[PDB]
Amino acid sequence: EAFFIPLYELFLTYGGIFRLTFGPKSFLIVSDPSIAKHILKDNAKAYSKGILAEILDFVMGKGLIPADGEIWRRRRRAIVPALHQKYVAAMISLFGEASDRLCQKLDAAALKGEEVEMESLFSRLTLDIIGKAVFNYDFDSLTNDTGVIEAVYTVLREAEDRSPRQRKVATSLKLINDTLDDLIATCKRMVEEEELQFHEEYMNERDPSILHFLLASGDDVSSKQLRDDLMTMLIAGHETSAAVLTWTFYLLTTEPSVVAKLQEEVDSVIGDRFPTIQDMKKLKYTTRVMNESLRLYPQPPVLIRRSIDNDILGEYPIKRGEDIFISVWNLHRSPLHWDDAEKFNPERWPLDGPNPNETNQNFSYLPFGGGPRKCIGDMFASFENVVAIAMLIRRFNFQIAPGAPPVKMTTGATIHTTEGLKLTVTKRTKPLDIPSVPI
Template identity: 30%
Template sequence: MLTPNIPPQPRFRYPGAVLFAFRRDPLGLLTRLARDYGDVVALRLARQHLVLINHPDLIRDVLVTHHRCFKKGRGLERVKRFLGEGLLTSEGEFHLRQRRMIQPAFHRQRIHGYGATMVAYAQRTAQRWQPGTTLDVAHEMMRLTLGVAGKTLFDADVEDEANEIGAALTELMHLFNVIASPLEEWLERLPLLPAARRFQRARDRLDRIVYRLIDERRRSGEDRGDLLSMLLQAQDIEGDGTGMSDQQIRDEAMTLLLAGHETTANALSWTWYLLSQHPEVEARFHAELDQALQGRAPTADDVTRLPYTRMVFSEALRLYPPAWIIGRRALVDYQLRDYRLPAGTVVVMSQYVMHRDPRFYPDPQRFDPERWRPEQVEQRPKFAYFPFGGGPRLCIGEQFAWMEGVLVLAAIGQRWRLRLAPGQTVEPEPLITLRPRGGLRMIVEPR
């Protein structure tokens, strides 16, 4: 496969065993490969040559230093089936053009202005809860962050449609591995298969909602200063001076509305779970809220006054990163240490694996926000932690997510503590994002 030297490559008992292992337990497989074979591991998945890299320096080289040697992996084409050519999926000059036009919506000052909306939706959620009730916190966080995304980016209250959007998105997530199988070329020719029909229906439900938002804004002609107004009016003044088509606006709206809220909701869900399992951390988290806020609602200015809350959120993102794997396809032959990867090789990097590497995180399975004290952060290589990716494809909403995470934790944590409902097994479900499998049932207790 690789010349002149071949990276370590595991042997499997029968053809297709690696694909079966990946389908059954991708997190376990990647973790074992990194543990048993080190920083570079070669394997073949279906018809694709893959190389898994497990060192911050190698990840930095692929995502930053030599990023022009790569493009996103084959999975990108699969995600395009419901996100289209949005920021997450577009490539090359088109991606740079779209990012230039969208970037102003994510400037620091504008994100700061979103803080009041984030807190308002968190308080609305907290006020709806009742003491002693058992809730699916994963669903509650999805509803909350969807409301925030709809209001801040599109000045629309979509919280009432959260159940419909959530059901459609969950359907898409679970069908993704069916539609995106090694037999995908045949599945595309068989649109009457039940999975293909459900995938199309779920995508159509989301399209109806997004196109309705676009149509309502076009008919009103209002400039509300939000992202949707920017998308409708944007012109690529550094490029050809043209704007976006309706399809392009749909693709960007779909990407930011759905991909953005999904990842933050998962991160918040895992944070509540981890706090419930570590009462000493939870007590310190509550003490910081009480001391810094003195009973008032948090604001964007308070984010810097809540360093421990951010440390808690950082540690949850380490253990359960919503984006748990990244792939890049080599455009040219690429030298990786002593190995020369032929063009077309897919280089895979797993945040889930890297974030649990004992070389950089002693006792890596332990939930310990103290890892995020500045002096400890400085001692680690940058790409030992990359929950938002890196390089030119760094998530455009990273600062939005950090602010939302801290403010939502603060606004809800002021009023409630959450306890894991008895009798359930909590485990990650690695779909496109890392969700709690089957939701996360928790009991609401007043502080």
């Protein structure tokens, strides 16, 4: 049962900052956007990632997420350049390819009248995408189970359990790290033999991965640090989007009028096409659907910090050493800052107006965090999810399956369901329809 739920009712009663105590230990729970902005942006230098490092160190090492200080600064500067406009445009092709692979599975299911458990399918889709995008590996988890795949999920579950088995985890970590080593070696040879001058918009068309960019850049790093950086991006970009897609499709089942409006846009703008970078700005309603899904189901629902200096939060002075949970769930669903906060309403932000972000929503909306530690994959993931949503909604009607297990939420790094999202899937286009390509 999700720990952030009781925090919502406590926020309603006790306000935007309170101290949650468990005997001799306590946590400050922050649900006020002004206080959130102070911690995440205005006075970020007074904060570390705190217990987040303790939870994640065993798998991410000194990757970007749990890092602080000079290690953080140096690696952020090295990695962000890889996610340039040319790279993101190339990844859109990957997003379409992988989404189409999922569509093929859904199509087979639909023809047989089989119900599908979409959370697991989305988890596989997003794993396949992130492995290829980050380090040029094809997990093909949409198609098969492998030892490497099982290792990733094992390490995942263990990370969240900290949010026999110890040996299983150790073995899984070894297998992933050994796989990353092989990939790094292969990429090194490829860079050695290639004939491309490195620059700000560098990418090898045959291997557009972030790993390849890092190696071609002349990245001054240890093998340990590189593996940790890769592992970190793998975790960061996998279950996050898996949950975004899962919750988006859950939400679509709750509002047929939204589905109708989404179908109208997809049919009109892309039809059967793989989306391109140009379609990203035209898929306005699809983007709003995603925006609204992230508002209702943030990933993660809580951001973690610890004070390393004195500060003032709201009216309250604090010392160093305070463990702080910023409740993104509360910020996103705050009755004071959102009209009909529990309603799934993609048009709560004007369709043709600017896309919502932490700046224009003044820290009441933080889908990708904020300030210096904001997600580096915000554009990547926003586009990834728009592609997957659009291609699936073009091809299929989805409904909650009769007798499906109830949809409920769990604790964890991301908001998982308790038992999956079991849906019926039916085709919207005919097998013998000619592919339709709108321009």
